[PDB]
Design an enzyme around this catalytic site. Structure first.
Site, PDB file in Angstrom:
ATOM      1  N   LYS A 102     125.450  16.828  66.557  1.00 21.03           N
ATOM      2  CA  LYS A 102     124.261  15.997  66.301  1.00 21.03           C
ATOM      3  C   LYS A 102     122.991  16.873  66.234  1.00 21.03           C
ATOM      4  O   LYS A 102     121.970  16.461  65.678  1.00 21.03           O
ATOM      5  CB  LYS A 102     124.109  14.875  67.362  1.00 21.03           C
TER       6      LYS A 102
ATOM      7  N   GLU B  64     118.684   4.825  68.529  1.00 21.08           N
ATOM      8  CA  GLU B  64     119.128   4.811  69.918  1.00 21.08           C
ATOM      9  C   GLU B  64     118.175   3.990  70.826  1.00 21.08           C
ATOM     10  O   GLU B  64     118.654   3.190  71.642  1.00 21.08           O
ATOM     11  CB  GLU B  64     119.431   6.240  70.421  1.00 21.08           C
TER      12      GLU B  64
ATOM     13  N   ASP C 133     116.071   8.137  78.222  1.00 21.98           N
ATOM     14  CA  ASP C 133     117.426   8.567  77.877  1.00 21.98           C
ATOM     15  C   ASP C 133     117.582   9.987  78.439  1.00 21.98           C
ATOM     16  O   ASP C 133     116.926  10.939  78.008  1.00 21.98           O
ATOM     17  CB  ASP C 133     117.647   8.505  76.369  1.00 21.98           C
TER      18      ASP C 133
ATOM     19  N   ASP D 251     128.663   4.276  68.735  1.00 26.55           N
ATOM     20  CA  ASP D 251     127.621   5.135  69.264  1.00 26.55           C
ATOM     21  C   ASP D 251     128.129   6.572  69.070  1.00 26.55           C
ATOM     22  O   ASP D 251     129.123   7.020  69.650  1.00 26.55           O
ATOM     23  CB  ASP D 251     127.307   4.884  70.727  1.00 26.55           C
TER      24      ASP D 251
END
Length: 600
Positions: free
Chosen positions: A67, A168, A191, A5
């Site tokens: 990211k 995800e 999330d 991850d």
């Protein structure tokens, strides 16, 4: 294959221990490691906690939150805001990509993000003991190919082959076990991470034949929760201290950073208890000496500072439903990801909106890695799909009369693929056939790799040439070879199934190419005999019957001469001599001028 991850703020790695999920721990003893990389001034490349622990000391060469940048271009809405807030020297690349400048050198962010993966790879390798060469990796749902490939490029630079790259929300759905065991589920993935928020509403359908994992609607926010909330608390803690101890902190970068980390922990407690104490030894110092900070905070003082931003997580939760056209009852499962999803207030406010309590039956700074592990392990293990036309080495075929490989699936064709050919018995009153399954590229069947053999028995007392024996070769999408042979007269089938891992390996495949390219002259010299042997067999067999059909129509001299040559052809056909067979066919055919007139 390992499950990595790759997050915004935090990284975690996992594997399937048999069927059982196992989440791994770094050499320092951390599981969820910070996605921070720091180039120390005297050259050391540090990752993780020892990249955070010095982050105040060399920020211009501290890389975090990559990211956001990973595969975006200098003129973009994220890059333009990141250039406004991020401390490290972001630049435009020579291709217009969003790149970094560190200690004066230009670098492409897959290279940077690789230092997380190299640490994660080391962390995984250190538990397994064997060198890993493979990955599965996470991404958000709204990433394009450039952003998806940039992460795969980051994989390759780390010496990890990316054997799938998964989303995800898919990872969240997989993680809580929603692989199977319903016909359909409509999932909400909430999330609320380290430094980002996503809502992804996704559909998992099995009613199309145990295959669809689809994203129905996604939305999210860039600067949500956290920074505008914890700032209400940071500022109370400043003004309480300013009131109690007569000194400011907004002037002190270190006290601000320590107050941030300390108060952000305290906020997370107060949604789970009535009170916690914001203790900070040696916070600031003045002419009266040091100041020690110990401030008591309660949920009740807190709740009266923080009237806003959880609702800003229920607002896009409206659009994610309004765009999709669904109601809160239509959703089976609301599932949690992200470390802020331990704070009761979001668990409460999500439950209050959806009506059914959100699932957190797997740890939400690991679950999204278990989502990688469960794909990477037993699943991509083996399994699945796609389509046709060409690539993709060696040929597949069978042994025919002559002892020659006759090809059914050609060299350099993709999978899945289905092809067939019709064959026959070779003798009269022949009641069975051998089916010999060859992998190779040589003519002579004894020079090719025997994958398998099987029988088809019970062919009726027909004459040869006539029984219609279908041979079908089917290669499925997992690479598994299924060979089937069938008589069309009776309908009696027989089969064999051969594994994708059966047959010739890479070096045997290389040999076979060298073998078949070098022996082309020798193999042709054989193929050009097989053809002649088979012509001679047809003539030998047919001319025997053309005598038996003729009978008393055929004179004695003809019968005597023809039958003499028939015997000799039946001797020459026990030779490997082509020329004798071509000659004896002529020696036979020359004397069958009158025979052919009768057979005509």
């Amino acid at each position: 294959i390992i499950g990595i991850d790759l997050g915004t703020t935090n990284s975690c790695v996992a594997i399937m221990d048999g069927t059982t999920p196992r989440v791994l721990e770094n050499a320092e003893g951390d599981r969820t490691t910070p996605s921070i990389i720091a180039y120390t001034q005297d050259g050391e490349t540090l990752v993780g906690q020892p990249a955070k622990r010095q982050a105040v000391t060399n920020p211009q060469n501290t890389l975090f939150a990559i990211k956001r940048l990973i595969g975006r271009r200098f003129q973009d809405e994220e890059v333009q805001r990141d250039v406004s807030i991020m401390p490290f020297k972001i630049i435009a690349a020579d291709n217009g990509d969003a790149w970094v400048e560190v200690k004066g050198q230009k670098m492409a962010p897959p290279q940077i993000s690789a230092e997380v993966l190299k640490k994660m790879k080391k962390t995984a390798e250190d538990y397994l003991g064997e060198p890993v060469t493979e990955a599965v990796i996470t991404v958000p749902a709204y990433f394009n190919d450039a952003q998806r490939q940039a992460t795969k490029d980051a994989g390759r630079i780390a010496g990890l082959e990316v054997k799938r790259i998964i989303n995800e929300p898919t990872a969240a759905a997989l993680a809580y076990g929603l692989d199977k065991g319903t016909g359909n589920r409509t999932i909400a993935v909430y999330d609320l991470g380290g430094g980002t928020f996503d809502i992804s509403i996704i559909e998992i359908d099995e009613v199309d034949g145990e295959k669809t994992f689809e994203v129905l609607a996604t939305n999210g926010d860039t600067h949500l929760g956290g920074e505008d909330f914890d700032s209400r608390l940071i500022n109370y803690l400043v003004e309480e201290f300013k009131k109690d101890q007569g000194i400011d902190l907004r002037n002190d970068p270190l006290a601000m950073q320590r107050l941030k980390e300390a108060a952000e922990k305290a906020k997370i407690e107060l949604s789970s208890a009535q009170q916690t104490d914001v203790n900070l030894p040696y916070i600031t110092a003045d002419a009266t000496g040091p100041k020690h900070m110990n401030i008591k905070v309660t949920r009740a003082k807190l709740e009266s500072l923080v009237e806003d931003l959880v609702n800003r997580s229920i607002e896009p939760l409206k659009v994610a439903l309004q765009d999709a056209g669904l109601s809160v009852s239509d959703i089976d499962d609301v599932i949690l990801v992200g470390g802020q999803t331990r704070m009761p207030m979001v668990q409460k406010k999500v439950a209050e909106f959806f009506g059914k309590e959100p699932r957190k039956d797997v740890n939400p700074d690991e679950a999204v890695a278990i989502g990688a592990a469960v794909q990477g392990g037993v699943l991509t293990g083996d399994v699945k799909d796609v389509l046709l036309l060409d690539v993709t080495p060696l040929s597949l075929g069978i042994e025919t009369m002559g002892g020659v490989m006759t090809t059914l699936i050609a060299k350099n064709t993709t999978i899945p693929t289905k092809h067939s050919q019709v064959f026959s018995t070779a003798e009269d009153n022949q009641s069975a056939v051998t089916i010999h399954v060859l992998q190779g590229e040589r003519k002579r069947a004894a020079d090719n790799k025997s994958l398998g053999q099987f029988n088809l028995d019970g062919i009726n007392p027909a004459p040869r040439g006539m029984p219609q024996i279908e041979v079908t070769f089917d290669i499925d999408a997992d690479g598994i070879l299924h060979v089937s042979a069938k008589d069309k007269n009776s309908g009696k089938e027989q089969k064999i199934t051969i594994k994708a891992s059966s047959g010739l390996n890479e070096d045997e495949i290389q040999k076979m190419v060298r073998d078949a390219e070098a022996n082309a002259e020798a193999d042709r010299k054989f193929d050009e005999l097989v053809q002649t042997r088979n012509q001679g067999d047809h003539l030998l067999h047919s001319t025997r019957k053309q005598v038996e059909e003729a009978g008393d129509k055929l004179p004695a001299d003809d019968k005597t001469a023809i039958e003499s040559a028939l015997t000799a052809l039946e001797t020459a056909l026990k030779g490997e001599d082509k020329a004798a067979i071509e000659a004896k066919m002529q020696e036979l055919a020359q004397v069958s001028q009158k025979l052919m007139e009768i057979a005509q």
